[PDB]
């Protein structure tokens, strides 16, 4: 047996979210849904509030979320039991997102390289960016408006604690390389504004 | 109180081999089943077998079928798995789902294996000084650069954790040559400056290493 979800779902607070599960005769098989908010182990629905409600028939089963919180923004898994292999049997799971979050434009912070890394015969440039949401960020670094995309590492966004996102990129360069350019920039945009910081040997 | 308890983080290297033991408490252990279940980072669940712990029997997925081991131990409630020859696709959270004897009710906290062939580095500390561009409106920028360690994780505090406040310490990034790399900033007055000492307390209990970094301005 296969189980197939939506991979996503998105939804404004307080409306009423639906995820399918969809398999061979589903409707005669019992479905269980399990819940999994990130950083933490999976805690099991199944229906805790009664805006939790199930309902299984012909061949998708369906959790529905009534009067929908941010506290339920997480990850959902129907389950079953494939009785030809005494199987448990997970299916894709879907992200449910809520539309009620305020948007945020992303604060940058650029630091130049340490005299002591410098005296190590190493430098990284290192660019701090927070309080932005929705999460997606992309960055990018200049060297005299030259494009550079050689020893760039950047992070993946991560919520913060004030429920906004930050992620941070590191250039990787050479003493000779960094003291050879008159500045370096990293640029970072976010739902196409964009924010710059320079820094430069001086 | 139905919980169950698995064993701390594992490091291990591409070859080797890993236990992890899973403790049940506030049920009889033997009258419900055991599953497991692993999670890779970014990926969805798959589950991987069950052992009932009355006749010890297992029944495995196809795909772990060979490499895992299940056991378990009557006496102390605890069941076991055991993950031979390790691969870097083995990375991934590893749980314990407690399974009716139709409940598949509870789940332990689960167990990180992170499977790699970077070796165990403490990092070089590097402070982040202030200065212009770090100060914007009477508040400057301080930081302090952890750089190059592997395993996860570190901890940093500033002032031996007398400066909470305006404190944001980043994820770490996982470079390509396998070592990890964090910062932690601080947004102070500038007024401050001059008249207070801060210094970022970097701890990494896995290379037994601790670095308190003073940072200066410029």
């Known amino acids: 047996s296969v189980l197939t979800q939506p991979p996503s779902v998105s939804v404004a607070p307080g409306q009423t979210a639906r995820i399918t599960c969809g398999g061979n005769?589903?409707?005669?098989?019992?479905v269980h849904w399990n819940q999994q908010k990130p950083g933490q182990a999976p805690v099991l629905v199944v229906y805790i509030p009664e805006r939790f409600s199930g309902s299984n028939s012909g061949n998708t089963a369906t959790l529905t979320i009534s009067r929908v919180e941010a506290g339920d923004e997480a990850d959902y898994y129907c389950?079953?039991?494939?009785?030809?292999?005494?199987?448990?049997?997970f299916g894709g799971g879907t992200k449910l997102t809520v539309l009620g979050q305020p948007k945020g434009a992303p604060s940058v912070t650029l630091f130049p390289p340490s005299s002591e890394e410098l005296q190590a015969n190493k430098a990284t440039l290192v660019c701090l960016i927070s309080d932005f949401y929705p999460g997606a960020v992309t960055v990018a670094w200049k060297a005299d408006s030259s494009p550079v995309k050689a020893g760039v590492e950047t992070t993946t966004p991560s919520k913060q604690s004030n429920n906004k996102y930050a992620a941070s990129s590191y250039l990787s360069l050479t003493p000779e390389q960094w003291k050879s350019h008159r500045s370096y920039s990293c640029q970072v945009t976010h739902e196409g504004s964009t924010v710059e910081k320079t820094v430069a040997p001086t | 109180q139905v919980q169950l308890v698995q064993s701390g983080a594992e490091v291990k290297k591409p070859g080797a081999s890993v236990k992890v033991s899973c403790k049940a408490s506030?049920?009889?252990?033997?009258?419900?089943?055991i599953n497991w279940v692993r999670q890779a980072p970014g990926q969805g669940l798959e589950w991987m077998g069950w052992?009932?712990?009355?006749?010890?029997?297992?029944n495995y997925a196809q795909k772990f079928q060979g490499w895992v081991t299940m056991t378990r131990d009557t006496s102390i409630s605890t069941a076991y798995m055991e993950l031979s020859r390790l691969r870097s696709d083995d990375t991934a959270v590893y749980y314990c789902?407690?399974?009716?004897?139709?409940?598949?009710?509870?789940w332990g906290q689960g167990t990180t294996v992170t499977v790699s062939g970077a070796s165990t580095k403490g990092p070089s500390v590097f402070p982040l000084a202030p200065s212009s561009k770090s100060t914007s409106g009477g508040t400057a920028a301080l930081g302090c650069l952890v750089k190059d360690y592997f395993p996860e994780p570190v901890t940093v505090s500033w002032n031996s954790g007398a400066l909470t406040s305006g404190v944001h310490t980043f994820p770490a990034v996982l470079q390509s040559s396998g070592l990890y790399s964090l910062s932690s900033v601080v947004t102070v007055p500038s007024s401050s400056l001059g008249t207070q000492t801060y210094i970022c307390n970097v701890n990494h209990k896995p290379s037994n290493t601790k670095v308190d970094k003073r940072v200066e301005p410029k």
């Open positions: 005769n589903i409707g005669s098989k019992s």
């Open positions: 506030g049920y009889t252990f033997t009258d419900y089943y």
């Open positions: 789902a407690r399974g009716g004897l139709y409940g598949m009710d509870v």
């Open positions: 389950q079953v039991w494939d009785s030809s292999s005494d199987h448990v049997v």
């Open positions: 052992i009932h712990p009355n006749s010890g029997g297992t």
